[PDB]
What we know:
homodimer, alpha+beta, 2 domains, 5-stranded antiparallel β-sheet, binds ligand KYL
Amino acid sequence: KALDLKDITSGRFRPENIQGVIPMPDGEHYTQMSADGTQIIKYSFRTGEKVEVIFDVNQARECDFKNFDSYQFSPDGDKLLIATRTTPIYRHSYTAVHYIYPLKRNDKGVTTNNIIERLSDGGPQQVPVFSPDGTMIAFVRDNNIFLVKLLYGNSESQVTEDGKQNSVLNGIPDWVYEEEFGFNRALEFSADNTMIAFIRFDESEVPSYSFPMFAGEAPQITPLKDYPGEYTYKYPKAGYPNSKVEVRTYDIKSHVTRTMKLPIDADGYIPRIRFTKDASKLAVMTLNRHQDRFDLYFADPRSTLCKLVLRDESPYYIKENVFDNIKFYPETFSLLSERDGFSHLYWYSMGGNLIKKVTNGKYEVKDFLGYDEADGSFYYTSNEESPLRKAVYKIDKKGKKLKLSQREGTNTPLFSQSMKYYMNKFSNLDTPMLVTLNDNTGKTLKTLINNDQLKQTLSGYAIPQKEFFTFQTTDGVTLNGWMMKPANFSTSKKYPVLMYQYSGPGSQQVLDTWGISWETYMASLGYIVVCVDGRGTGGRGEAFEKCTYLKIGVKEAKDQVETALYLGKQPYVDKDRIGIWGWSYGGYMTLMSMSEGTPVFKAGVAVAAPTDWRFYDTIYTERFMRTPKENAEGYKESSAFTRADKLHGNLLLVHGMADDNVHFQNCAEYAEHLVQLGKQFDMQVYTNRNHGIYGGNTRQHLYTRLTNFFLNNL
Amino acid sequence: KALDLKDITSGRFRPENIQGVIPMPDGEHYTQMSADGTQIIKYSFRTGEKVEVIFDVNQARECDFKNFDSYQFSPDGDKLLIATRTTPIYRHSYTAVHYIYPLKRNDKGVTTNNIIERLSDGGPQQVPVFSPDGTMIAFVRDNNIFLVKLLYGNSESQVTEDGKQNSVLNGIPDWVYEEEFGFNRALEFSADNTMIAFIRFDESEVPSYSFPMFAGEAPQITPLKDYPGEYTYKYPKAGYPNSKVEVRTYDIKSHVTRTMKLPIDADGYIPRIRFTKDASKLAVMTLNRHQDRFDLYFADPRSTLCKLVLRDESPYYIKENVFDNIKFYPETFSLLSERDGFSHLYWYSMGGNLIKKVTNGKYEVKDFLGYDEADGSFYYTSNEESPLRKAVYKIDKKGKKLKLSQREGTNTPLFSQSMKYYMNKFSNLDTPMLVTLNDNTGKTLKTLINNDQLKQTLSGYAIPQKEFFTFQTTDGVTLNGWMMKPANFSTSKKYPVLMYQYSGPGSQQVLDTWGISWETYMASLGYIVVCVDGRGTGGRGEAFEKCTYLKIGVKEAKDQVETALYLGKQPYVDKDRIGIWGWSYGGYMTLMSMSEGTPVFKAGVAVAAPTDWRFYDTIYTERFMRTPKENAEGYKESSAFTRADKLHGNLLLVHGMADDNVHFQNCAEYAEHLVQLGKQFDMQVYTNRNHGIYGGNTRQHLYTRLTNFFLNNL
Lengths: 714, 714
Ligand SMILES: COc1cc2c(cc1OC)[C@@H](Cc1ccc(Oc3cc(C[C@@H]4c5cc(OC)c(OC)cc5CCN4C)ccc3OC)cc1)N(C)CC2
Ligand SMILES: COc1cc2c(cc1OC)[C@@H](Cc1ccc(Oc3cc(C[C@@H]4c5cc(OC)c(OC)cc5CCN4C)ccc3OC)cc1)N(C)CC2
């Protein structure tokens, strides 16, 4: 009956789901890895049937490993690139040891008895990518680009020789690009398999940041058992210099390198490079440093000449979302733009002239899934039904629209190569996970996972239920939230409240989807738990989110206080016992709200909080606030330091000391400012821990601390 | 009527005392620094009379400063060396700008209108030392020795060339020597003013250690306002290499440098050098790495030859207190030795023959004050009366012993240049501070200070009273301690208990001397506060102190546990409500006691605490434990890590992150192990703070947190 935190932090209630699902190039099958990690099995999109195991560790020849982590197909589906020994660097980048496995069928009718081959004789590799004809793979190692010709007995050549750690990176983004522009690779083949193009990052003039490493446990870093070590990398703080970037091309046949004559600002960005279906046109997406002039260029890989193709200006800032929704077809490309105050899908010609605006209306397109070149149709995801919901929609050449999703809540799709079939994951507040196959009309072909077992297990526990709600601020805005009530609820009783939030620009934590979390536990202990996404939050247009431009956190704090006051109006809430917490931007938000000047909170917890935006990185910070030189007062009014003396309530700072995102510096400096103000607070710092704050019993330790802190300060 | 914590932390109740009393060469007078530090004034030992003002900032000529911090008289009495702009480095080293003030009476007959002179036209100087005749001064700057000839224009010469930071130190100890042998100088003139001797420390192959520095506040480290920086220094953890040391002599007339041919162990120590009354005998004191063999060598500054004069072997270790109690007379020198199980005074010929053991008994001689060569009288200090007490004693040429100290308590003496008079600073639990002037025989000639108006101020508040007691552990050992009860105590009521302790090898906290501390405030808040010195502590002989050898902490934790059980038996104590606290070893002893096994402590605070001796430095740690390799089992049995699973009570860890003595690494690693064990606990980390944890509001902040933790955990 009773909910145990250990089961939660353990992931005991984690819904079953298929992992490692990769669409085959055929358009009719998908593959998934086995639970063991010993096999890649090919299943069918139309029926869900298993077809055969295409790869097996205990069946290959020359296969030394016995587990692999991930894999991709060659464009035509006869080779596999299988990744082993995957080792994280940052959130998106990793090294791995890759093997090429051919899928030819042998004299017994199977594909599983073939000879594995190594991608490279040297050390582990990064971001390997097939050429369009499947005959070549480029990867990056030690900040240099290497090319393997598979038609030449995997002949390896070195395409770049300038890379150095903390100086020059070839093909892979630096730290801040990788995190805030969302990518791990800037390395492309041309349509005709004759050129390679890549971004080159001179980061040598970027500041260096370092933090201590100890031995710690889980993992224990044994060489540091007596004397500590450190981590050193380039990380540009707000207003400081970013990497100098250039786009270069390598003529495979002639071994020649060229530098595209790209007329961008000295301090500009080059978030992506993507080769088009034109082998003589390479798309280069550029931003100005204000990040509000998206300039898409087409560059000629030989002439080095670049022609401006499109510009999307915003009165605020372009968002990273947009770049990867730009898919290139033989005659056209796609684009996601908020130019009309909402995220919508524009269809453009390869000459730069608009063709069609495919969507419109007061709602947000979230993803562009693809364009079916057979029936003229567009497939995308959207929140048209509710901001809290996501569904899958089709629009045909004639402009008729059809909602493919069959249930209401959150729908996440994965289409086949041909776009004939797709695999849907559905969830909502009551449905943990419904995985199905579906056709292009959305008709259900088969239910793959339905999670009977989890529900039955849950049916024996007293789980508090979330219900959405809405309320109106004092100046007239309607905000969405959810409330979880303890299981013997009674509006004659008076309850404490824990508010959770994130509140970061463009984010949403109030969604019609399913989770049991630490907040579920708190409610099972007798706490009303609320969450309200306020101003600056996503899903409701550019206006709702970008009201915070140049002065962030202020309006978010005012709406968190608004939520506290609305709840204090309810007869069943005890206004002297509201607490607030959050993580990342949310920890910042706990700070801002608790020191907003209106003394409505009794306790709060700030986990890995930025405290003054001059400590955080260029791309994210500047997108919203500009440089400190240009926006001094905004920095002043957006800083937790400025309003610290008005802090009211008891605080718990929680930070990991090996946080390479929000630096521990934030916590150190803010804590010292609170010590000089004379404010009493509490601390919990975790050794060798990152932004995630995980490792062994770390998370159970952490959530037990939060539970104790709020039980004691109420 | 109510004691305030701000008055404790701001030193409102500090007893009045005298500064800078330096006996003059006359044998009849002393000099002291004026209250405001603008005047150096002469006084008579016999009458207490102000005789004249030697120096006055307001009267001196061409004097740019308005304040000074210290002064050193010339051996002849001709000149004064004034120290201004005193800037600490570590705990005993510092740089200051020094001035030579001539002391010649004018036409008016006064010595207060002469032109002050700079010692060096260059930069700040360290440990400046006079030559016996007073015509020369040696000092250190930038790790190099400099000589100034006063007879010849105050001319400066450079004795040494190879000083490099973090590599070669000349005349000054490296970090660990300064801290654990307790000295700041290794730089001396021969008796005939012809030679300089010094220790040359080569610390190049000593491990570097480093920790982050932020901007902080009070002081704010301004260049670190965006990017942190670091502090780096040499620091060998236990069993790592120490400095390569060697003695050197510089010929003042011929500029020749020689190195003494000294048969010391490759891993041995030279804790001190000292010139004797014979100009051709330099005494070098040497230890082995086990610090259990003390070897006194006499060395020829010109032949480089070295003759072993003395060998003192201890079964445990030699204590530091011997080194500075070796005083050289024309035919004899002094020595303190624990050979007899107690610290006693031995009188040796300058040929190495023992002449006599001057003291005997079951008591310890703490300091050797001197020898009156006129009447063959010895003067020293001792706890003969009680381990809690300290008194001045005389022993004449026939062996008659006479306690000089009139009152019982703690008596601290300062003698005249002739041993014919001495100033006495007396205190005990009921007496804040008596400063008197006394004679050879011990009579009180005058009472300079009685600290009456402090007794006045205090009467107005309810100050809890300390009182001593003893108790017997379950194995017959009797322990000394004090108990402080709240000014409204009733045997009818049950009270909660706060135990303070330090417990480090050789130390005493239960002493008959006066203080108002944080513990006094807790007592005024309703706590019975107890301090108990347990096994391992000083005052009672080598057997009782050094029973902990090779396995530290275990028996000290046992006796704190016994203290808790004994208090729990008392009819007026709530045994479910007892707490423990400490700083340094004291914090380590908080740790060890709270995880001893017998779960008696409800709460506890550990400030700046060590947690595994493999983290701590070479000299201190190896003195009691030897190296981690030789004593692995002892290191494992003494680790706070090894017993961490048995930790009981709520614990607060408090550390300064810039702690250069107990590295914050101790805190990080111990906290991590407690996380992986699932032990909840609290943290308070102080930014940019060292072992003493101070600056701006810091202390007022720290002690408030400690108050609340104990109020909240009872
Ligand atoms: C919803 O809040 C967040 C939203 C957003 C962000 C971070 C957030 O909060 C850290 C960041 C992106 C970002 C995401 C994760 C990040 O570092 C980690 C954080 C956690 C904490 C783990 C978690 C994990 C996530 O996925 C990896 C996540 O995705 C948005 C959110 C959260 C939060 C809760 N949970 C406690 C675990 C592992 C991590 O790296 C291995 C560092 C940065 N951008 C601003 C995008 C929107
Ligand atoms: C009984 O305790 C101690 C004894 C002993 C030690 C340290 C102790 O306790 C930190 C160390 C010597 C030592 C002394 C001080 C040190 O760092 C500082 C600590 C404090 C804290 C200030 C304090 C100050 C002292 O003198 C300076 C002191 O001497 C007995 C004890 C204490 C206590 C706390 N009080 C709150 C203030 C300033 C400091 O450096 C400028 C670092 C090391 N050696 C092993 C000798 C015996």
